[PDB]
């Protein structure tokens, strides 16, 4: 049991002195016992003279110079395994749901090396998501990272939950949701909603692990939580072999936290006031989300854009790692289209002949082409009346309106809020379904047959029930 003594407390920075070379490695978790419970520090630097500088994971009010400090012998560790599913967990792996100890048998460090260059899967590949818009038009990369855009009131939470659900049923992979700087009020919402939707099931089996680093916690805590959430996600890949979803809400709050820790550590700020380690801080998180030979952790990360300036060093660094974006728009929502994904805005590196095959690409590029003139044609149809359209134009526009509505879809999780049955359309259907519509094989169907239905057979089934 290796002991030290607090020698300094300056806000969330705490210095501790030790005995000769009994010094904790940088990134070790240290512990002080407080009457609150216990305070964790993470070793940041070796200052010299057997003194190390640390970052606090909780408040430091009340500390006294000379107080004992215990070395854990390693980095912050977190429980891993199925006993984390359906539970709420903080940055230091403690349960914060008043539901008792995470009776997990193993624990792993949050700091760890990425899969080796040799361990790296060598061919990019689609993660089929069960969602038309995404699969067809902006498919997710397996072991990739995806930027989720647009703030609130666009069904982000239902969209995330549908993903947790589609992945677990279609690929039997679990999810980990990391609220990085999560607003306590909103975490409490999410938890209640997850129970209501089924994805957490306290009396049964849960599909998702919740890890929260709330806004009222010190930067140290907010910077590390992502890695907490990620470690749990890695265990499902490395030991259970699954294709795993990792949600990070919000990735910008990870950056800002490290900006703040860096500032407390005395480091001279870089451009725009971000930490000089902005890119490596980002790399140390991202490079761990990838496809090994065992599985993949794939991550859906919510991205805030400061000043709506996309060249700002935070998005700019983030974007470097993003394989796709899903752009949720109120403008798509206010036309009653659910999920409110924007088909023109949402983009993927993998919408590519080589990755998805020549079919998939061709179908999607036409859909894209179609919707594109229809967008510019919103301008003349608003002035010239409808009739003023040319032969191929008045058709594709009648058929665009038809595509634009076929991009809707009922979510199995929305079911409880809606009563409409939910549909997980396989990518296979999604491709043909859209190819056929584009070829004119369904022009003689009224638009409403296309709204809130799964695969083509439901456009068929629906239109026959509208008939009487």
């Amino acid at each position: 049991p290796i002991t030290g003594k607090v020698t300094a407390v300056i806000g969330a920075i705490v210095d501790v002195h030790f005995e000769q070379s009994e010094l904790p490695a940088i990134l070790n978790a240290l512990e002080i016992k407080t009457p609150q419970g216990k305070l964790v520090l993470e070793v940041a630097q070796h200052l010299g003279e057997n003194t190390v500088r640390t970052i606090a994971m909780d408040g430091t009010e009340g500390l006294v110079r000379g107080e004992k400090v215990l070395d854990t012998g390693g980095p912050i560790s977190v429980p891993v395994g199925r006993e984390t599913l359906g539970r709420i967990i903080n940055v230091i792996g403690e349960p914060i749901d008043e539901r008792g100890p995470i009776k997990s048998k193993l624990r792993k460090p949050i700091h760890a090396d990425p899969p080796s260059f040799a361990e790296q899967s060598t061919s990019a590949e689609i993660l089929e998501t069960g969602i038309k818009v995404v699969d067809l038009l902006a498919p997710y990369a397996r072991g990739g990272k995806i930027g989720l855009f647009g703030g609130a009131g666009v069904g982000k939470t239902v969209f995330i939950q549908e993903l947790i659900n589609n992945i677990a049923k279609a690929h039997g992979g679990f999810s980990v949701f990391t609220g990085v700087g999560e607003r306590t009020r909103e975490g409490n919402d999410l938890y209640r909603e997850m129970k209501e939707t089924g994805v957490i099931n306290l009396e049964g089996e849960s599909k998702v692990a919740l890890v929260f680093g709330q806004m009222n916690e010190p930067p140290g805590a907010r910077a590390r939580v992502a890695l907490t959430g990620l470690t749990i996600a890695e265990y499902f890949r490395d030991e259970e072999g699954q294709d795993v979803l990792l949600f990070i809400d919000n990735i910008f709050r990870f950056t800002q936290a490290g900006s703040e820790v860096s500032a407390l550590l005395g480091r001279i700020p870089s451009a725009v006031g971000y930490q000089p380690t902005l890119a490596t801080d980002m790399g140390l998180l991202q490079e761990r989300i990838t496809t090994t030979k065992k599985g993949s952790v794939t991550s859906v990360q919510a991205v805030y854009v400061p000043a709506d300036d996309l060249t700002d060093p935070a998005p700019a660094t983030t974007f470097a790692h993003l394989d796709a974006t899903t752009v949720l728009s109120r403008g798509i929502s206010e036309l009653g289209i659910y999920p409110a994904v924007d088909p023109l805005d949402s983009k993927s590196r993998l919408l590519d002949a080589a990755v998805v095959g020549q079919e998939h690409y061709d179908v999607a590029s036409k859909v894209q082409e179609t919707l594109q003139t229809y967008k510019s044609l919103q301008d003349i149809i608003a002035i010239l009346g409808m009739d003023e359209l040319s032969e191929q134009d008045k058709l594709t526009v009648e058929r665009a309106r038809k595509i634009q509505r076929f991009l809707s879809q009922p979510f199995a999780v929305a079911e409880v809020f809606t009563g409409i049955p939910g549909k997980l359309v396989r990518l296979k259907d999604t491709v043909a379904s859209f190819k056929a519509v584009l070829e004119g094989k369904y022009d003689n169907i009224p638009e409403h047959a296309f709204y809130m239905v799964g695969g083509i057979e439901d456009v068929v089934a629906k239109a026959e029930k509208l008939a009487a």
């Binding site: 607090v6 300094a8 009010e61 010190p218």
Partner: protein, 482 residues
């Protein structure tokens, strides 16, 4: 001695660097020879850095300093209602000692994830624009933000005034106790505020916590957390407190003073890396507690002053993202006579409908819409426009005018909904734009003499049935014709 005492090594700029005090707690309070107090923010090997609560002309090198053994606490309890206190809870209003239920610390763990419930009960501000378009619920943190002199205090203040409607009742679950934090303001400004509350008989349910412009930086820094704990007594005991932090711009300035003078590292705009943590620590304490935990709530109106409307500044950024929405005020609108000068298209309450009386939600549904469509077609307001656009323009002008309101005159919900209804539904179209004010006044009094039944139902039921709606429709046209 040295475990319990210290020698002043150096003093200057409200920083006392102190030798000894080897057993002191971080953030613990100290006492000096001359009697000036301070708190120990920097614990270092050689020394302790103490920030002073009073003029440092009172401190000298060599001077003796004692521990008090206490982290900053503050008295809390109902006995503070009607009182005006400094940041440590000393009475400053000449009304005698303050009776305390007990004492809470300045810094308190915000309620966790689990002991909460979704925001649902409204904080009725009395302000048509807010209650109709940017509704606030008990537990929520809603930011009042804008450039100087745009009406920010006024929004907070009409809100506090409006709580007379329940704070004179007997049903503790409906009452809303009020805490107002004056950070960095001038004393005569706090004095005049007090007088206003006194005149409208709102002091009885309010507590003023004042750390004004001449007061040492620590006290301005502390005042919010300290007021927060005062608020929390209500929350922890099955009641509902509203806390206004007027304002957080000035509190961030105070903390920056301390940090720069303690030589902690500076960052953007010279703020310390823990200025986000200061405000989030502070603001997560507003909360809507679970049924197990008593259903208490604390609702926060932090104020932020922007400079040139730049919400990307360091402190507004921090606070915009911590909170649940923005009420955005603007000089432009203000000068046009739109008061409160709320910019609808920039204001939001992420909570939204869940916190609105159902009646107001019923009539306002479309208000959100017409006004949205209004400010889109605005540049058209300057001859040739189809009857579609002429209409859109007619409507919006009037709905805008309906949202003007005098200061110190908050409206009951049952007074708000019929006014909003008339507009929303086109009963104001044929009425020249200058007469919308006198219309509101006359129409209200007419409903009060002739239709007290409709108003009583709106108030007592909170929803509008198709019978209420139909009744409302008739009574309106009735008046508009007349």
């Amino acid at each position: 001695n040295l475990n319990e005492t210290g020698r002043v090594l150096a003093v200057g700029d409200g920083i006392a660097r102190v030798f000894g005090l080897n057993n002191i707690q971080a953030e613990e309070l100290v006492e000096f020879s001359s009697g000036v107090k301070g708190m120990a923010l920097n614990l270092e090997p050689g020394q302790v850095g103490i920030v002073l609560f009073g003029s440092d002309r009172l401190v000298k090198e060599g001077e003796l300093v004692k521990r008090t053994g206490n982290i900053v606490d503050v008295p809390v309890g109902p006995g503070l209602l009607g009182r005006v206190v400094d940041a440590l809870g000393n009475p400053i209003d000449g009304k005698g000692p303050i009776d305390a239920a007990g004492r809470s610390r300045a810094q308190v763990k915000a309620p966790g994830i689990l002991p909460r419930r979704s925001v649902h009960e409204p904080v009725q501000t009395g302000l048509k624009a807010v209650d109709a378009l940017v509704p606030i619920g008990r537990g929520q943190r809603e930011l009042i933000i804008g450039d100087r002199q745009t009406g920010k205090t006024a929004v907070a203040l009409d809100t506090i005034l409006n709580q007379k409607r329940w704070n004179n009742g007997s049903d503790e679950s409906k009452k809303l106790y009020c805490v107002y934090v004056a950070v960095g303001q001038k004393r005569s400004t706090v004095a005049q505020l007090v007088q206003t509350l006194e005149q409208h008989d709102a002091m009885k349910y309010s507590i003023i916590v004042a750390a004004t412009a001449s007061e040492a930086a620590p006290l301005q820094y502390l005042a919010p957390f300290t007021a927060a704990s005062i608020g929390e007594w209500f929350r922890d005991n099955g009641k509902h407190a509203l806390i206004v932090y007027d304002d957080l711009s000035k509190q961030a300035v105070a903390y920056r003073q301390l940090s720069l003078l303690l030589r902690r590292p500076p960052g953007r705009e010279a703020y310390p890396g823990d200025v986000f943590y200061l405000h989030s620590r502070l603001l997560e304490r507003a909360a809507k507690l679970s049924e197990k935990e008593g259903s208490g709530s604390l609702t926060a109106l932090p104020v932020i002053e922007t400079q040139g409307g730049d919400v990307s500044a360091y402190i507004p950024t921090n606070v915009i993202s911590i909170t649940d929405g923005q009420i955005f005020l603007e000089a432009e609108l203000f000068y046009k006579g739109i008061r409160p000068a709320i910019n609808v298209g920039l204001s939001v309450s992420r909570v939204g409908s869940a916190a609105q009386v159902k009646a107001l939600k019923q009539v306002a549904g479309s208000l959100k819409l017409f006004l949205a469509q209004y400010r889109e077609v605005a540049a058209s307001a300057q001859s040739d426009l189809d009857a579609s656009t002429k209409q859109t323009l007619v409507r919006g002008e009037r709905l805008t005018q309906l949202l003007k309101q005098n200061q110190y005159s908050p409206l009951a919900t049952e007074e708000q909904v019929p006014l909003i209804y008339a507009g929303v539904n086109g009963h104001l179209d044929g009425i020249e734009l200058s007469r919308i004010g006198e219309f509101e006044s006359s129409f209200l009094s007419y409903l009060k003499s002739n239709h007290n039944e409709l108003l009583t139902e709106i108030r007592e039921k909170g929803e509008l049935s198709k019978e209420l709606l139909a009744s409302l429709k008739s009574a309106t046209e009735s008046f508009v014709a007349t």
